[PDB]
PDB file of N, CA and C in Angstrom:
ATOM      1  N   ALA A 323      20.374  35.965 151.303  1.00 46.15           N
ATOM      2  CA  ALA A 323      21.722  36.352 151.803  1.00 46.15           C
ATOM      3  C   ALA A 323      21.953  35.734 153.182  1.00 46.15           C
ATOM      4  N   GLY A 324      22.730  34.687 153.252  1.00 43.04           N
ATOM      5  CA  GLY A 324      22.993  34.038 154.568  1.00 43.04           C
ATOM      6  C   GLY A 324      23.893  32.818 154.366  1.00 43.04           C
ATOM      7  N   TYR A 325      24.969  32.976 153.645  1.00 38.39           N
ATOM      8  CA  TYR A 325      25.885  31.823 153.411  1.00 38.39           C
ATOM      9  C   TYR A 325      26.919  31.757 154.536  1.00 38.39           C
ATOM     10  N   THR A 326      27.081  30.611 155.135  1.00 38.38           N
ATOM     11  CA  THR A 326      28.073  30.481 156.237  1.00 38.38           C
ATOM     12  C   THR A 326      29.209  29.557 155.789  1.00 38.38           C
ATOM     13  N   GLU A 327      30.370  29.710 156.362  1.00 39.46           N
ATOM     14  CA  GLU A 327      31.515  28.842 155.969  1.00 39.46           C
ATOM     15  C   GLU A 327      31.069  27.377 155.967  1.00 39.46           C
ATOM     16  N   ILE A 328      30.272  26.990 156.925  1.00 38.98           N
ATOM     17  CA  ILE A 328      29.807  25.576 156.985  1.00 38.98           C
ATOM     18  C   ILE A 328      29.047  25.221 155.703  1.00 38.98           C
ATOM     19  N   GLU A 329      27.987  25.925 155.408  1.00 41.37           N
ATOM     20  CA  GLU A 329      27.212  25.616 154.172  1.00 41.37           C
ATOM     21  C   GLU A 329      28.174  25.449 152.993  1.00 41.37           C
ATOM     22  N   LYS A 330      28.932  26.469 152.690  1.00 42.84           N
ATOM     23  CA  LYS A 330      29.891  26.375 151.554  1.00 42.84           C
ATOM     24  C   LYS A 330      30.735  25.109 151.703  1.00 42.84           C
ATOM     25  N   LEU A 331      31.132  24.786 152.904  1.00 42.02           N
ATOM     26  CA  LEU A 331      31.959  23.565 153.110  1.00 42.02           C
ATOM     27  C   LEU A 331      31.146  22.324 152.732  1.00 42.02           C
ATOM     28  N   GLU A 332      29.914  22.258 153.158  1.00 43.64           N
ATOM     29  CA  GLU A 332      29.069  21.076 152.831  1.00 43.64           C
ATOM     30  C   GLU A 332      28.996  20.896 151.312  1.00 43.64           C
ATOM     31  N   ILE A 333      28.522  21.890 150.610  1.00 42.14           N
ATOM     32  CA  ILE A 333      28.418  21.774 149.124  1.00 42.14           C
ATOM     33  C   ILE A 333      29.814  21.662 148.510  1.00 42.14           C
ATOM     34  N   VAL A 334      30.613  22.678 148.660  1.00 39.98           N
ATOM     35  CA  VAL A 334      31.987  22.653 148.080  1.00 39.98           C
ATOM     36  C   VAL A 334      32.604  21.262 148.226  1.00 39.98           C
ATOM     37  N   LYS A 335      32.369  20.596 149.316  1.00 37.87           N
ATOM     38  CA  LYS A 335      32.981  19.250 149.494  1.00 37.87           C
ATOM     39  C   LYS A 335      32.183  18.174 148.745  1.00 37.87           C
ATOM     40  N   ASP A 336      30.882  18.253 148.751  1.00 40.95           N
ATOM     41  CA  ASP A 336      30.071  17.205 148.061  1.00 40.95           C
ATOM     42  C   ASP A 336      29.998  17.461 146.550  1.00 40.95           C
ATOM     43  N   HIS A 337      29.543  18.619 146.157  1.00 37.20           N
ATOM     44  CA  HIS A 337      29.395  18.936 144.700  1.00 37.20           C
ATOM     45  C   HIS A 337      30.696  18.693 143.921  1.00 37.20           C
ATOM     46  N   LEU A 338      31.830  19.011 144.476  1.00 36.38           N
ATOM     47  CA  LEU A 338      33.096  18.814 143.712  1.00 36.38           C
ATOM     48  C   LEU A 338      33.097  17.469 142.967  1.00 36.38           C
ATOM     49  N   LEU A 339      32.558  16.426 143.543  1.00 37.03           N
ATOM     50  CA  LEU A 339      32.591  15.103 142.843  1.00 37.03           C
ATOM     51  C   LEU A 339      31.483  14.992 141.779  1.00 37.03           C
ATOM     52  N   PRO A 340      30.227  15.136 142.138  1.00 39.73           N
ATOM     53  CA  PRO A 340      29.105  15.017 141.158  1.00 39.73           C
ATOM     54  C   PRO A 340      29.061  16.185 140.168  1.00 39.73           C
ATOM     55  N   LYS A 341      29.108  17.391 140.656  1.00 37.59           N
ATOM     56  CA  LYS A 341      29.060  18.566 139.741  1.00 37.59           C
ATOM     57  C   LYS A 341      30.127  18.417 138.652  1.00 37.59           C
ATOM     58  N   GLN A 342      31.355  18.718 138.970  1.00 36.87           N
ATOM     59  CA  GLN A 342      32.445  18.606 137.959  1.00 36.87           C
ATOM     60  C   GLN A 342      32.271  17.331 137.127  1.00 36.87           C
ATOM     61  N   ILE A 343      32.122  16.206 137.769  1.00 39.57           N
ATOM     62  CA  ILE A 343      31.964  14.928 137.016  1.00 39.57           C
ATOM     63  C   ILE A 343      30.853  15.058 135.969  1.00 39.57           C
ATOM     64  N   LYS A 344      29.781  15.730 136.290  1.00 39.55           N
ATOM     65  CA  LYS A 344      28.667  15.862 135.304  1.00 39.55           C
ATOM     66  C   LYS A 344      29.072  16.795 134.159  1.00 39.55           C
ATOM     67  N   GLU A 345      28.996  18.082 134.366  1.00 40.03           N
ATOM     68  CA  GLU A 345      29.372  19.027 133.278  1.00 40.03           C
ATOM     69  C   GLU A 345      30.597  18.479 132.550  1.00 40.03           C
ATOM     70  N   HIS A 346      31.525  17.930 133.282  1.00 38.16           N
ATOM     71  CA  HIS A 346      32.743  17.359 132.646  1.00 38.16           C
ATOM     72  C   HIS A 346      32.418  15.965 132.119  1.00 38.16           C
ATOM     73  N   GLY A 347      31.635  15.224 132.854  1.00 36.64           N
ATOM     74  CA  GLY A 347      31.259  13.850 132.417  1.00 36.64           C
ATOM     75  C   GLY A 347      31.012  13.839 130.908  1.00 36.64           C
ATOM     76  N   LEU A 348      30.435  14.886 130.382  1.00 38.92           N
ATOM     77  CA  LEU A 348      30.158  14.918 128.917  1.00 38.92           C
ATOM     78  C   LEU A 348      31.303  14.228 128.169  1.00 38.92           C
ATOM     79  N   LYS A 349      32.518  14.442 128.594  1.00 38.56           N
ATOM     80  CA  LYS A 349      33.668  13.777 127.921  1.00 38.56           C
ATOM     81  C   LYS A 349      34.091  12.568 128.757  1.00 38.56           C
ATOM     82  N   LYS A 350      34.788  11.633 128.174  1.00 38.74           N
ATOM     83  CA  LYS A 350      35.215  10.441 128.957  1.00 38.74           C
ATOM     84  C   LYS A 350      35.638  10.883 130.358  1.00 38.74           C
ATOM     85  N   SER A 351      35.279  10.131 131.365  1.00 36.10           N
ATOM     86  CA  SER A 351      35.659  10.512 132.757  1.00 36.10           C
ATOM     87  C   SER A 351      37.018  11.212 132.740  1.00 36.10           C
ATOM     88  N   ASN A 352      37.019  12.514 132.672  1.00 35.99           N
ATOM     89  CA  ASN A 352      38.309  13.258 132.637  1.00 35.99           C
ATOM     90  C   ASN A 352      38.411  14.180 133.856  1.00 35.99           C
ATOM     91  N   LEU A 353      38.379  13.631 135.042  1.00 33.96           N
ATOM     92  CA  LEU A 353      38.479  14.491 136.255  1.00 33.96           C
ATOM     93  C   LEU A 353      38.901  13.653 137.464  1.00 33.96           C
ATOM     94  N   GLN A 354      40.021  13.972 138.055  1.00 31.46           N
ATOM     95  CA  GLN A 354      40.484  13.209 139.249  1.00 31.46           C
ATOM     96  C   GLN A 354      41.217  14.166 140.194  1.00 31.46           C
ATOM     97  N   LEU A 355      40.499  15.060 140.816  1.00 32.51           N
ATOM     98  CA  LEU A 355      41.146  16.031 141.739  1.00 32.51           C
ATOM     99  C   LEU A 355      41.172  15.465 143.158  1.00 32.51           C
ATOM    100  N   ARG A 356      41.773  16.182 144.064  1.00 29.08           N
ATOM    101  CA  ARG A 356      41.843  15.711 145.475  1.00 29.08           C
ATOM    102  C   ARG A 356      41.167  16.739 146.383  1.00 29.08           C
ATOM    103  N   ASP A 357      40.889  16.379 147.606  1.00 26.10           N
ATOM    104  CA  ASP A 357      40.233  17.342 148.534  1.00 26.10           C
ATOM    105  C   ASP A 357      41.224  18.452 148.894  1.00 26.10           C
ATOM    106  N   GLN A 358      42.428  18.088 149.244  1.00 24.74           N
ATOM    107  CA  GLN A 358      43.446  19.113 149.607  1.00 24.74           C
ATOM    108  C   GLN A 358      43.436  20.241 148.573  1.00 24.74           C
ATOM    109  N   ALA A 359      43.285  19.911 147.321  1.00 25.33           N
ATOM    110  CA  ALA A 359      43.275  20.966 146.266  1.00 25.33           C
ATOM    111  C   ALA A 359      42.083  21.906 146.477  1.00 25.33           C
ATOM    112  N   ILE A 360      40.891  21.421 146.269  1.00 25.41           N
ATOM    113  CA  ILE A 360      39.688  22.287 146.445  1.00 25.41           C
ATOM    114  C   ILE A 360      39.868  23.187 147.671  1.00 25.41           C
ATOM    115  N   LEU A 361      40.391  22.657 148.743  1.00 23.36           N
ATOM    116  CA  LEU A 361      40.583  23.489 149.966  1.00 23.36           C
ATOM    117  C   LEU A 361      41.745  24.462 149.758  1.00 23.36           C
ATOM    118  N   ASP A 362      42.793  24.015 149.127  1.00 21.88           N
ATOM    119  CA  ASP A 362      43.963  24.907 148.892  1.00 21.88           C
ATOM    120  C   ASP A 362      43.551  26.067 147.985  1.00 21.88           C
ATOM    121  N   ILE A 363      43.163  25.780 146.775  1.00 26.68           N
ATOM    122  CA  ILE A 363      42.751  26.872 145.847  1.00 26.68           C
ATOM    123  C   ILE A 363      41.875  27.883 146.596  1.00 26.68           C
ATOM    124  N   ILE A 364      40.666  27.511 146.918  1.00 25.30           N
ATOM    125  CA  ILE A 364      39.760  28.449 147.642  1.00 25.30           C
ATOM    126  C   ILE A 364      40.511  29.110 148.801  1.00 25.30           C
ATOM    127  N   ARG A 365      41.328  28.367 149.495  1.00 28.30           N
ATOM    128  CA  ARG A 365      42.081  28.953 150.642  1.00 28.30           C
ATOM    129  C   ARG A 365      42.981  30.088 150.148  1.00 28.30           C
ATOM    130  N   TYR A 366      43.592  29.929 149.006  1.00 22.42           N
ATOM    131  CA  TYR A 366      44.483  31.003 148.484  1.00 22.42           C
ATOM    132  C   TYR A 366      43.633  32.130 147.899  1.00 22.42           C
ATOM    133  N   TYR A 367      42.572  31.790 147.221  1.00 22.45           N
ATOM    134  CA  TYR A 367      41.703  32.839 146.619  1.00 22.45           C
ATOM    135  C   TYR A 367      40.682  33.322 147.647  1.00 22.45           C
ATOM    136  N   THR A 368      39.869  32.436 148.154  1.00 25.06           N
ATOM    137  CA  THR A 368      38.850  32.857 149.153  1.00 25.06           C
ATOM    138  C   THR A 368      38.147  34.118 148.645  1.00 25.06           C
ATOM    139  N   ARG A 369      38.399  34.490 147.420  1.00 25.85           N
ATOM    140  CA  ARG A 369      37.752  35.709 146.856  1.00 25.85           C
ATOM    141  C   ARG A 369      36.453  35.310 146.151  1.00 25.85           C
ATOM    142  N   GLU A 370      35.353  35.912 146.517  1.00 27.89           N
ATOM    143  CA  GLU A 370      34.063  35.552 145.861  1.00 27.89           C
ATOM    144  C   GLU A 370      32.908  36.295 146.533  1.00 27.89           C
ATOM    145  N   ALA A 371      31.759  36.293 145.913  1.00 27.16           N
ATOM    146  CA  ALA A 371      30.581  36.984 146.507  1.00 27.16           C
ATOM    147  C   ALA A 371      29.417  35.995 146.587  1.00 27.16           C
ATOM    148  N   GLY A 372      29.710  34.748 146.841  1.00 25.12           N
ATOM    149  CA  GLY A 372      28.637  33.725 146.924  1.00 25.12           C
ATOM    150  C   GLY A 372      29.200  32.377 146.474  1.00 25.12           C
ATOM    151  N   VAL A 373      28.584  31.302 146.873  1.00 29.57           N
ATOM    152  CA  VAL A 373      29.092  29.961 146.469  1.00 29.57           C
ATOM    153  C   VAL A 373      29.022  29.814 144.948  1.00 29.57           C
ATOM    154  N   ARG A 374      27.946  30.240 144.347  1.00 32.98           N
ATOM    155  CA  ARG A 374      27.828  30.117 142.867  1.00 32.98           C
ATOM    156  C   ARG A 374      29.180  30.435 142.226  1.00 32.98           C
ATOM    157  N   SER A 375      29.739  31.571 142.536  1.00 34.27           N
ATOM    158  CA  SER A 375      31.057  31.934 141.948  1.00 34.27           C
ATOM    159  C   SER A 375      32.099  30.903 142.374  1.00 34.27           C
ATOM    160  N   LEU A 376      32.178  30.618 143.642  1.00 31.35           N
ATOM    161  CA  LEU A 376      33.169  29.614 144.114  1.00 31.35           C
ATOM    162  C   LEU A 376      33.081  28.385 143.213  1.00 31.35           C
ATOM    163  N   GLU A 377      31.947  27.742 143.191  1.00 32.04           N
ATOM    164  CA  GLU A 377      31.791  26.549 142.318  1.00 32.04           C
ATOM    165  C   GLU A 377      32.324  26.889 140.928  1.00 32.04           C
ATOM    166  N   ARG A 378      32.069  28.084 140.462  1.00 29.45           N
ATOM    167  CA  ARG A 378      32.564  28.476 139.114  1.00 29.45           C
ATOM    168  C   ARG A 378      34.093  28.433 139.103  1.00 29.45           C
ATOM    169  N   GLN A 379      34.719  28.868 140.161  1.00 25.03           N
ATOM    170  CA  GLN A 379      36.207  28.841 140.203  1.00 25.03           C
ATOM    171  C   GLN A 379      36.675  27.388 140.100  1.00 25.03           C
ATOM    172  N   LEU A 380      36.099  26.520 140.885  1.00 23.88           N
ATOM    173  CA  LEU A 380      36.494  25.087 140.831  1.00 23.88           C
ATOM    174  C   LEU A 380      36.228  24.555 139.425  1.00 23.88           C
ATOM    175  N   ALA A 381      35.035  24.738 138.928  1.00 17.50           N
ATOM    176  CA  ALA A 381      34.726  24.255 137.556  1.00 17.50           C
ATOM    177  C   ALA A 381      35.759  24.835 136.592  1.00 17.50           C
ATOM    178  N   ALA A 382      36.134  26.068 136.797  1.00 18.45           N
ATOM    179  CA  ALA A 382      37.136  26.709 135.899  1.00 18.45           C
ATOM    180  C   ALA A 382      38.413  25.867 135.870  1.00 18.45           C
ATOM    181  N   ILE A 383      38.986  25.589 137.010  1.00 17.97           N
ATOM    182  CA  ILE A 383      40.233  24.770 137.031  1.00 17.97           C
ATOM    183  C   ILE A 383      39.929  23.369 136.493  1.00 17.97           C
ATOM    184  N   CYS A 384      38.844  22.787 136.924  1.00 18.25           N
ATOM    185  CA  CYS A 384      38.488  21.421 136.448  1.00 18.25           C
ATOM    186  C   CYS A 384      38.465  21.392 134.918  1.00 18.25           C
ATOM    187  N   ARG A 385      37.486  22.006 134.312  1.00 16.30           N
ATOM    188  CA  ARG A 385      37.417  21.998 132.824  1.00 16.30           C
ATOM    189  C   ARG A 385      38.715  22.560 132.245  1.00 16.30           C
ATOM    190  N   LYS A 386      39.170  23.686 132.732  1.00 14.59           N
ATOM    191  CA  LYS A 386      40.442  24.248 132.204  1.00 14.59           C
ATOM    192  C   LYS A 386      41.393  23.080 131.992  1.00 14.59           C
ATOM    193  N   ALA A 387      41.367  22.147 132.900  1.00 13.74           N
ATOM    194  CA  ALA A 387      42.231  20.947 132.769  1.00 13.74           C
ATOM    195  C   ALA A 387      41.650  20.051 131.675  1.00 13.74           C
ATOM    196  N   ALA A 388      40.346  19.947 131.611  1.00 14.60           N
ATOM    197  CA  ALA A 388      39.718  19.092 130.565  1.00 14.60           C
ATOM    198  C   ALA A 388      40.200  19.544 129.185  1.00 14.60           C
ATOM    199  N   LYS A 389      40.278  20.827 128.963  1.00 17.56           N
ATOM    200  CA  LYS A 389      40.743  21.328 127.639  1.00 17.56           C
ATOM    201  C   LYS A 389      42.084  20.677 127.300  1.00 17.56           C
ATOM    202  N   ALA A 390      42.940  20.534 128.272  1.00 15.64           N
ATOM    203  CA  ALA A 390      44.266  19.907 128.014  1.00 15.64           C
ATOM    204  C   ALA A 390      44.065  18.511 127.420  1.00 15.64           C
ATOM    205  N   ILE A 391      42.839  18.112 127.223  1.00 15.91           N
ATOM    206  CA  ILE A 391      42.580  16.761 126.647  1.00 15.91           C
ATOM    207  C   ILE A 391      43.515  16.529 125.459  1.00 15.91           C
ATOM    208  N   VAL A 392      44.203  17.550 125.025  1.00 12.87           N
ATOM    209  CA  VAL A 392      45.131  17.391 123.869  1.00 12.87           C
ATOM    210  C   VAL A 392      46.514  16.981 124.382  1.00 12.87           C
ATOM    211  N   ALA A 393      46.564  16.259 125.467  1.00 14.14           N
ATOM    212  CA  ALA A 393      47.880  15.827 126.016  1.00 14.14           C
ATOM    213  C   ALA A 393      48.367  14.594 125.256  1.00 14.14           C
ATOM    214  N   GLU A 394      49.387  13.944 125.750  1.00 11.66           N
ATOM    215  CA  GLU A 394      49.905  12.736 125.052  1.00 11.66           C
ATOM    216  C   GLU A 394      48.832  11.646 125.059  1.00 11.66           C
ATOM    217  N   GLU A 395      48.533  11.100 126.205  1.00  8.81           N
ATOM    218  CA  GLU A 395      47.495  10.034 126.275  1.00  8.81           C
ATOM    219  C   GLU A 395      47.137   9.763 127.738  1.00  8.81           C
ATOM    220  N   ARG A 396      47.666  10.541 128.642  1.00  6.84           N
ATOM    221  CA  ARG A 396      47.353  10.327 130.083  1.00  6.84           C
ATOM    222  C   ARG A 396      45.860  10.554 130.317  1.00  6.84           C
ATOM    223  N   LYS A 397      45.121   9.504 130.555  1.00  3.30           N
ATOM    224  CA  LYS A 397      43.658   9.660 130.789  1.00  3.30           C
ATOM    225  C   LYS A 397      43.417  10.131 132.223  1.00  3.30           C
ATOM    226  N   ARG A 398      42.222  10.564 132.522  1.00  2.30           N
ATOM    227  CA  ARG A 398      41.924  11.035 133.903  1.00  2.30           C
ATOM    228  C   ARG A 398      42.909  12.138 134.292  1.00  2.30           C
ATOM    229  N   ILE A 399      42.466  13.366 134.310  1.00  2.25           N
ATOM    230  CA  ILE A 399      43.382  14.478 134.687  1.00  2.25           C
ATOM    231  C   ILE A 399      43.471  14.559 136.211  1.00  2.25           C
ATOM    232  N   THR A 400      44.638  14.362 136.756  1.00  2.00           N
ATOM    233  CA  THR A 400      44.785  14.422 138.237  1.00  2.00           C
ATOM    234  C   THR A 400      45.054  15.866 138.666  1.00  2.00           C
ATOM    235  N   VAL A 401      44.234  16.397 139.532  1.00  2.00           N
ATOM    236  CA  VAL A 401      44.446  17.798 139.992  1.00  2.00           C
ATOM    237  C   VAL A 401      44.854  17.792 141.464  1.00  2.00           C
ATOM    238  N   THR A 402      46.000  17.251 141.764  1.00  2.00           N
ATOM    239  CA  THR A 402      46.458  17.215 143.180  1.00  2.00           C
ATOM    240  C   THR A 402      46.718  18.642 143.664  1.00  2.00           C
ATOM    241  N   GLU A 403      47.333  18.794 144.804  1.00  2.00           N
ATOM    242  CA  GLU A 403      47.616  20.161 145.316  1.00  2.00           C
ATOM    243  C   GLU A 403      48.717  20.795 144.466  1.00  2.00           C
ATOM    244  N   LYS A 404      49.534  19.986 143.848  1.00  2.00           N
ATOM    245  CA  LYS A 404      50.627  20.536 142.998  1.00  2.00           C
ATOM    246  C   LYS A 404      50.046  20.967 141.651  1.00  2.00           C
ATOM    247  N   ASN A 405      49.540  20.037 140.890  1.00  2.00           N
ATOM    248  CA  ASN A 405      48.950  20.397 139.572  1.00  2.00           C
ATOM    249  C   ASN A 405      48.048  21.621 139.746  1.00  2.00           C
ATOM    250  N   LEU A 406      47.316  21.675 140.827  1.00  2.00           N
ATOM    251  CA  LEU A 406      46.413  22.839 141.062  1.00  2.00           C
ATOM    252  C   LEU A 406      47.122  24.127 140.641  1.00  2.00           C
ATOM    253  N   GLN A 407      48.384  24.249 140.948  1.00  2.00           N
ATOM    254  CA  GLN A 407      49.128  25.481 140.564  1.00  2.00           C
ATOM    255  C   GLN A 407      49.327  25.504 139.047  1.00  2.00           C
ATOM    256  N   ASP A 408      49.827  24.436 138.486  1.00  2.00           N
ATOM    257  CA  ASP A 408      50.045  24.403 137.013  1.00  2.00           C
ATOM    258  C   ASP A 408      48.768  24.846 136.298  1.00  2.00           C
ATOM    259  N   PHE A 409      47.633  24.378 136.743  1.00  3.11           N
ATOM    260  CA  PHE A 409      46.354  24.775 136.089  1.00  3.11           C
ATOM    261  C   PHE A 409      46.058  26.244 136.400  1.00  3.11           C
ATOM    262  N   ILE A 410      45.893  26.572 137.652  1.00  3.14           N
ATOM    263  CA  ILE A 410      45.598  27.985 138.020  1.00  3.14           C
ATOM    264  C   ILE A 410      46.749  28.885 137.558  1.00  3.14           C
ATOM    265  N   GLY A 411      47.959  28.550 137.911  1.00  2.14           N
ATOM    266  CA  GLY A 411      49.116  29.390 137.491  1.00  2.14           C
ATOM    267  C   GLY A 411      48.961  30.794 138.078  1.00  2.14           C
ATOM    268  N   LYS A 412      49.823  31.166 138.983  1.00  2.00           N
ATOM    269  CA  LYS A 412      49.722  32.521 139.596  1.00  2.00           C
ATOM    270  C   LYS A 412      48.649  32.504 140.688  1.00  2.00           C
ATOM    271  N   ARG A 413      48.724  33.412 141.622  1.00  2.00           N
ATOM    272  CA  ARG A 413      47.706  33.442 142.710  1.00  2.00           C
ATOM    273  C   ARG A 413      47.398  34.893 143.085  1.00  2.00           C
ATOM    274  N   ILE A 414      46.763  35.101 144.206  1.00  2.00           N
ATOM    275  CA  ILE A 414      46.432  36.489 144.632  1.00  2.00           C
ATOM    276  C   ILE A 414      47.148  36.796 145.950  1.00  2.00           C
ATOM    277  N   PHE A 415      46.851  36.057 146.984  1.00  2.00           N
ATOM    278  CA  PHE A 415      47.518  36.304 148.294  1.00  2.00           C
ATOM    279  C   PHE A 415      48.854  35.560 148.328  1.00  2.00           C
ATOM    280  N   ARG A 416      49.938  36.274 148.458  1.00  2.00           N
ATOM    281  CA  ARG A 416      51.270  35.605 148.493  1.00  2.00           C
ATOM    282  C   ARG A 416      51.658  35.315 149.945  1.00  2.00           C
ATOM    283  N   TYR A 417      51.363  34.136 150.422  1.00  2.00           N
ATOM    284  CA  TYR A 417      51.715  33.791 151.828  1.00  2.00           C
ATOM    285  C   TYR A 417      51.315  34.944 152.752  1.00  2.00           C
TER     286      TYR A 417
END
C-alpha cells in the first residue's frame, strides 16, 4: 500500500501504449488513443482503489472500442478526447 499520483502517472502514461496494444494486439492493430484522453477519462472518474483497477478502466474503453470492430471499415480505432465520451458514454462528476 503506497501508490502515489506520480507512480500511477508513470505507468498510466507508459503502459497505455504497450499494454492496450498487447491484449488488443491480438486483433489487427486496432487501437489509436491520445494522451489527453487517458488523462481526461481518469480525470473525470479518478474513482478507483489502486492502479490495477485504473488500467482496467482504460482497457475497458480501449477494448470496448475494439468490439466496435463491426464498423464500416475504418481501421485503427481513434480514441481522442471526444470519442472518449462516445465510448464511455455518461460520467460521474458533472463539472
